[PDB]
Amino acid sequence: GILHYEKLSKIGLVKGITRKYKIKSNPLTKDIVIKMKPNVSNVSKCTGTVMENYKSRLTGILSPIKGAIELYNNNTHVVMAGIAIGIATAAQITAGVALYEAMKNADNINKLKSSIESTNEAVVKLQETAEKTVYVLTALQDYINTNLVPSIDQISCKQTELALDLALSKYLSDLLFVFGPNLQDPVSNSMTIQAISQAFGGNYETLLRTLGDFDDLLESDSITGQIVYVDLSSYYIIVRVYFPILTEIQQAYVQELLPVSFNNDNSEWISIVPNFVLIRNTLISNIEVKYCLITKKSVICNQDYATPMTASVRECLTGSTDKCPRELVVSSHVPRFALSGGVLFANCISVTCQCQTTGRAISQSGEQTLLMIDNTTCTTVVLGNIIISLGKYLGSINYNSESIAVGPPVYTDKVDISSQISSMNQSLQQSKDYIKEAQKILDNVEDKIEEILS
Amino acid sequence: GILHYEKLSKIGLVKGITRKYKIKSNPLTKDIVIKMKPNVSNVSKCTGTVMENYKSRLTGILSPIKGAIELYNNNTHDLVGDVKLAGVVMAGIAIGIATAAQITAGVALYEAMKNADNINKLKSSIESTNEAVVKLQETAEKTVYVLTALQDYINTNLVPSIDQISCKQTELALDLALSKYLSDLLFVFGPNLQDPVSNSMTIQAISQAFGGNYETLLRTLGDFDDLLESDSITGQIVYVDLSSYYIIVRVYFPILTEIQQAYVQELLPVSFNNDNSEWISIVPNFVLIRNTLISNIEVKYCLITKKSVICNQDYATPMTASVRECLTGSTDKCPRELVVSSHVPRFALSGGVLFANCISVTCQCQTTGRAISQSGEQTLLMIDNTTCTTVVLGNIIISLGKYLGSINYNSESIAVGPPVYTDKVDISSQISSMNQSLQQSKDYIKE
Amino acid sequence: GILHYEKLSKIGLVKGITRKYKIKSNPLTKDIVIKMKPNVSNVSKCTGTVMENYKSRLTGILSPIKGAIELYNNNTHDLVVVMAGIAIGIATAAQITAGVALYEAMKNADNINKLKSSIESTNEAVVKLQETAEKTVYVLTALQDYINTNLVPSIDQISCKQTELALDLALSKYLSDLLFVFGPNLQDPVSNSMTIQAISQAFGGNYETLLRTLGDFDDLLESDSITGQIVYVDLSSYYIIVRVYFPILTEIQQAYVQELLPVSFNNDNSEWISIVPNFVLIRNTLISNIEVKYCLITKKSVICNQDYATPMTASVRECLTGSTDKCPRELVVSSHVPRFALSGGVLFANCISVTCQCQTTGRAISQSGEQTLLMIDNTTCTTVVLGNIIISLGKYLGSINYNSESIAVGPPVYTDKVDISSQISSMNQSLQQSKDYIKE
């Protein structure tokens, strides 16, 4: 049950931190306008057909989004038109419902079109008639206002236009990854606010700040954006930002296991067991922490990332160490000792351990996997080049007298898995014929005992 | 033959979109000059030895490319039987050890040489280009473009701030720009690009030398976006000039062809019920069918799109006969895995008909007012307008079509495949477990 | 020596380059100050509360580093260096060692810190300061250049909100850029893994200047061997001290990395590719796998920031050393897996899959169905036309009749993630099914 830490530590898995488990929930919606063509009316003398190009270029990347969105709109007549939609995922359907929900306010924001069209500055605060405000973030506007405008004199009219064309095209080449043919499904709310901000030049800080515990959300990619309206004549979008909160899962924790090479039968092994185990309620399972934000106190995820675990690997973690698979160590880099509870767990065959206080070297038998070193043999431990003072071990009084039973060896390598598999299939097939040497030589040579009876 | 779509949909894999399959082919080559040191002729007043430094710094990252390229140029002693279009001969002994890809890139390099040499004659005019992008005449009426790094910054920041800023400031700002640009280009062009006799480099990646602005680079040259987002527009470095600090890039702008009777079928996955628990099917979500043959495809590397999967190469991959069999009827061969996340999807829509896990989620009929409840004997419900016109599904209301398949999808039971664990760590334990077991029962056969 | 290159080449793995094996060692520490709030007193006019905001914002991302660092400092009580095990409680070796290095950095950190008020008022982007000894120390300050060469000149023709917008925007952009590396994300700052590139995110990614002010550099850089450790955080002046670990790389002895160039091959009416590592590490008499993906591959060497060796199954070992019937093979279904390679100036080609011909002798080079691959050298063709590429050949230094002698092909296998589970469960099902007949 709920983890056999000591048994585990001998096989080279020492207790790491225990962590709180958190997931986003309870989203909270807020709307923003991002304008994708800058102002220019203040510096319109020496532009040329850069705009006529940029616009039709932008229209090419923008229109298919509009098109994709509108297929959910003309076809949600609360109720979504299943025949019209035809083939879709639940996720998408829900995004579509959120979209329809956004429409009501989208429509009200859209009434300020001509005022959006003529925004002077980078970030503008507008009045949506209610006393409910709405923000317009316009791309390259700052550059235009504070580079182009003041350098106008010392540049000329054929080289301001170059500087403009270049800015526009750079901005384009930057936004293209996120907003290209690439975002094929824009009826979603997965797009991270960071990724959306690409349209405002990656400055998601300002985007969040004008809307007004933050970083933890941000670095879990839990702050998401949904595109809810596209205006093709004014070249702006409305984004609904989903700013959630994060909730602690109840009697759920994520246990880290610190891996440490260990000795068996003249060679160093490392245990093949998850380094992060999720325990919620009485149930132990795998978790894909790679997708979360690990943190001193908590694993923070934008969704549940639990994953099933085989009963062997479950048994392994709760005592049966002869079920934890082990792999050969051949790199001078897999770690050779760890510290847990102020007590040291060390491969004193691989590395040389000594007692600074008592002067005598701490030497490890070949019969043992690992040493548990605490303040009842050394107070201070010299460990190569690092000197470390130890606590008393809260576990078994004679950890080092009692021997763990090591599990089976295995190869972890992609290429070695296939060879192992074909090797095995070979062996099982080879010995699946000897079992067919009994369909005759135990059936006919026993139904001959019906004739040698009758 | 066909995928057994109905049998599949019970095991929680519903028909998604069917897509065209496209791959790039027939490049149309076009050449461009990228100059990697800006002008500074209109600034040379406060420049310390930052140019003297920057140059020798750049030479360090540039020269080995040149060197690498020129080993193919000395080694292709070619035109075969002297003549231009007769062909090209690569020196095998000289080259020694190379890949087909590389050899071909070498041939393309030799092919680029002819025009490279003609472009190179404008060296002194490249050397003194004033502006960021310049159009030059290669004598023929055939034009050639020079894109020069940091030039714009220099022309529109520094020259304008020169009257208002000092010296050990004007030079700081320059040193900083140059070193930033350097630290940005270093990933793509460093010791990293060990094999420059290639045409893999994407034009985006190449444009790192022009500060990531691949837009302008493409636009000065001339289905564009679909090419671009499949990384099918590639660049090859064909000449390096170490005194003028410029490179010639051959850009390979291809076209994309529809593969014939080949389509990529999406399967939308849906959690399904069996023996008191939710399972998800372990079967590819994307299957490539070309001709009568079904095989895997690595779409992760392609560009997926309403109508088509667009790839810069063929990405087909073999498929085990079991997983083949599974997709064409034998659902007892489709492996399944336990579901333990409140996130794996619980229903899908295909053909206007709903496939739902009405054990996991709670389904009801808005029109008929009665809840749609699912037996524990069944994996999944197919709900079509012949039981509900409108379906309330938690919080989403949805109007349905008539299912074009079996009149009683729900009365007939599928046979669920074997359970399996998908996890990296779990595969090793499963394997060692099995070895142990087979060895253990390989002695009883010796009894 | 170790490997069986000829036997291997028939199964479609031809000798590629042999490379030197190098790892970083012998690091060489040098210190630097990164200031994360620009000067701005030269436009202290209409900034507004943006500084008051920016500062408290920054404090939020910065303080937890300080905090984390100081827990090692508070708990290394020494000179004998002794680390407090009870206080530390639960840590890795790596981290402990980082801690020792941190304590080692403290001595100089403390001396650098005396110049606090002079750090506070640095005018320019990069400054050289005197740490009293004649030992200099550098201050790189963020956004300073932008401020000095955009905003200060663009004061005169810009409104008071206009100036402050441009500032707020620069600051917040810089923030949104640094946040990935320095956020809640860097949960363990008592380490020296952070690459100097990643560190330079605080100076706006310009790791070039950072390295250049401190003074075979690229190979280090592109192996991510040049690392930074944060050794001090100042929360009132908003600067950090970084100890940069600039190592040197050493050749491993009698160790090389062998590349294998893969080439589709023919067997029993279909094209196969061999499932064998493309890079094999041989050090001493021992052959093993190596994870090159993490290193820097280079004409002469594989360059790694650590040893990346990995064990190899005795079957795959045996395979590379003769037993080709142990090298697993997989069916080819993509018009993209390569069809010929060149090694030693001799050609190894699938002349069933592609059509091979002799330009010199005019006659086409055709391959039996009994053979996997053709070895083509100048003793049959001097020049070879191979689709659209013409190539002149050397003499093969191996067996005089490579093409008469047949290799024994290994077992077929499926490589695919999804196909492994089915293979595994199939093998299970079958073993269970035939584990009952043994109970009969």
Ligand SMILES: *[C@@H]1O[C@H](CO)[C@@H](O[C@@H]2O[C@H](CO)[C@@H](O)[C@H](O)[C@H]2NC(C)=O)[C@H](O)[C@H]1NC(C)=O
């Ligand atoms: C769905 O309906 C939208 C409107 O909601 C359609 O947009 C119209 O587009 C035409 C262009 O030919 C314009 O003349 C109209 O002004 C638009 N309609 C309205 C009411 O403003 C769109 O064509 C429809 N189709 C799809 C597939 O989304």
Ligand SMILES: *[C@@H]1O[C@H](CO)[C@@H](O[C@@H]2O[C@H](CO)[C@@H](O)[C@H](O)[C@H]2NC(C)=O)[C@H](O)[C@H]1NC(C)=O
């Ligand atoms: C159940 O769904 C089918 C197909 O979605 C509906 O049949 C269509 O009805 C519309 C409107 O009457 C016609 O324009 C189509 O031509 C019909 N298609 C077919 C293939 O018959 C049907 O109406 C739905 N049933 C109910 C009760 O709404």
Ligand SMILES: *[C@@H]1O[C@H](CO)[C@@H](O)[C@H](O)[C@H]1NC(C)=O
């Ligand atoms: C070991 O740990 C702590 C040190 O304070 C203490 O409680 C205990 O008495 C110590 N025991 C010995 C034998 O040193």
Ligand SMILES: *[C@@H]1O[C@H](CO)[C@@H](O)[C@H](O)[C@H]1NC(C)=O
């Ligand atoms: C370290 O100790 C001092 C007390 O003298 C205190 O000011 C500081 O906050 C402590 N920090 C930690 C992390 O314990």
Ligand SMILES: *[C@@H]1O[C@H](CO)[C@@H](O)[C@H](O)[C@H]1NC(C)=O
């Ligand atoms: C192959 O090439 C080299 C040329 O130096 C030579 O050693 C060898 O004799 C050649 N043989 C033939 C048949 O061309």
